[PDB]
């Protein structure tokens, strides 16, 4: 019937990789939410070559799952 009401929200909480709905993603270091599957990797066939760290397919920024819980008190100024 009417348009414009109950429809004013702009949020980017959708896995840009698989292009699906997010139920409980994991905010990366750079600031991106992805699925638990798209991130975690089971099938590892990296033999001839080394390396094995979930990268950021959204933009591409080497991050880690430790820096988040590395510092709690001593925080650096950003602004």
Residues that bind Zn ion (CB under 5 A): 15, 17-18, 30, 32, 35, 38, 56, 58-59
The minimum distance between CB 6 and Zn ion, in angstroms, equals 27
The minimum distance between CB 4 and Zn ion, in angstroms, equals 31
The span from the CA of 52 to the CA of 58, in Å, is 18
The span from the CA of 61 to the CA of 50, in Å, is 18
The minimum distance between CB 15 and Zn ion, in angstroms, equals 3
Q: Which of 10, 53, 17, 9 is nearest to 34 (CA)?
A: 17
* Radius of gyration of the CA atoms of the chain, in A: 17
Residue number, nearest CB to Zn ion: 15
> In the complex with Zn ion, which residue's Cβ is closer, 21 or 75?
21
- What are 16's two structure tokens? 């840009």
> In the complex with Zn ion, which residue's Cβ is closer, 47 or 78?
78
């Amino acid at each position: 019937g009417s348009s414009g009401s109950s429809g004013n929200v702009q949020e980017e909480v959708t896995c840009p990789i698989c292009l699906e709905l997010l139920t409980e993603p994991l905010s990366l270091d750079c600031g991106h939410s992805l699925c638990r599957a798209c991130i975690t990797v089971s099938n590892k066939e990296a033999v001839t070559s080394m390396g094995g760290k979930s990268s950021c397919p959204v933009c591409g920024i080497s991050y880690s799952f430790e820096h988040l819980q590395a510092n709690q008190h001593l925080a650096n100024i950003v602004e």
